[PDB]
């Protein structure tokens, strides 16, 4: 068996098993009850039908795998954005649990990112409806959304903590200059550093690199010397060591699908372009997962401009990078 093609799905991993859920395609959200598992050592798939509080089928959800427990936040279904939070213990028939979190949740959102640090899930950014005044951060409307939709939407720079000891939402008080509001950025965690690269804001797909110190809540902008990757959204950014982040794919401001790959060297603050055999397989809105065997496993996404919906080339291919 092989999963149907898709973009905007989630893929999370424990370093050996990759769990794939959700997304959409063209003849259409994929079936909500299906969980696809890819064994990274053997390269074979297995479909599991889940039960319990199965989430609606969505694209743009934000998921993590912590100690083989999957957590899912936010996303976009046929009736718009959500801020619901789910848990699926993958450690018998797997059962989704919708969690009743305490505290003030983030605004309903998709295309965001997350950092995992000890007992905390830390969510940043995204695209969705207007929040409430009490939320710390900034929100910027997408002007185009006032004619396309019944509810206008926009970008945020919000940082929210979900504390898994109590399933309670909070917001930290940060110092430094946060990145601008953005969506379709990519987040990656190494140690106590929550890195974020690129994303869409206003009329640009950006090339900037920041990290949030997850001990001190201080924001830092990184300015690597020399050649940097072109700005983009819908890319992946994946930790592959205690000193390296792996970047692949995405979409430029001028709407060019990308097949370039790079390593960011943290200790050197330097980007290194990565040579690979997939130069003719650009991907945007794919997922990337690191394996315990020195590989990055890219799945799904679209080979061309998926904003032209009737021509979109959604994929079900596995691309394997040896980093």
């Amino acid at each position: 068996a092989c999963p149907a093609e898709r973009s905007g799905h989630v893929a999370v991993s424990d370093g050996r098993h990759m769990f794939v859920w959700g997304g959409y395609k063209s003849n259409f959200y994929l079936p909500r009850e299906e969980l696809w598992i890819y064994n990274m050592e053997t390269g074979r798939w297995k479909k599991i039908n889940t039960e319990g509080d199965v989430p609606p089928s969505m694209s743009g959800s934000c998921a993590v795998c912590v100690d083989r427990v999957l957590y899912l936040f936010g996303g976009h279904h046929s009736r718009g954005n959500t801020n619901k939070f789910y848990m699926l213990d993958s450690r018998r028939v797997l059962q989704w649990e919708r969690i009743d979190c305490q505290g003030i949740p983030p605004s309903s959102k998709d295309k965001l990112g997350v950092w995992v640090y000890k007992n905390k899930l830390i969510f940043f950014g995204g695209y969705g409806y207007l929040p409430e005044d009490k939320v710390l951060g900034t929100f910027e409307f997408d002007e185009t959304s006032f004619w396309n939709s019944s509810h206008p939407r926009g970008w945020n720079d919000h940082v929210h903590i979900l504390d898994t000891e109590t399933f309670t939402w909070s917001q930290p008080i940060t110092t430094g200059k946060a990145p601008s509001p953005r969506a379709a950025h990519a987040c990656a965690t190494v140690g106590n550093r929550g890195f974020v690269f690129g994303g869409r804001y206003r009329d640009a797909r950006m090339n900037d690199l920041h990290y949030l110190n997850l001990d001190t809540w201080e924001w830092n902008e990184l300015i690597p010397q020399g050649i940097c990757p072109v700005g983009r959204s819908w890319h992946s950014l994946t930790p592959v060591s205690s000193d390296h982040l792996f970047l692949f794919g995405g979409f430029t401001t001028d709407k060019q699908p990308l097949s370039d790959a790079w390593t960011y060297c943290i200790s050197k603050n330097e980007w290194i372009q990565f040579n690979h055999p997939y130069t003719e397989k650009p991907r945007l809105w794919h997922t990337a997962c690191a394996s315990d065997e020195g590989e990055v496993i890219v799945f799904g996404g679209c080979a061309n401009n998926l904003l032209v919906h009737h021509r979109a080339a959604h994929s079900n291919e596995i691309l394997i990078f040896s980093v």
Binding site: Y24, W155, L307, H309
Partner: peptide, 6 residues
């Protein structure tokens, strides 16, 4: 509607 904001 699901692709906006990127």
């Amino acid at each position: 509607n699901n692709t906006s904001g990127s």
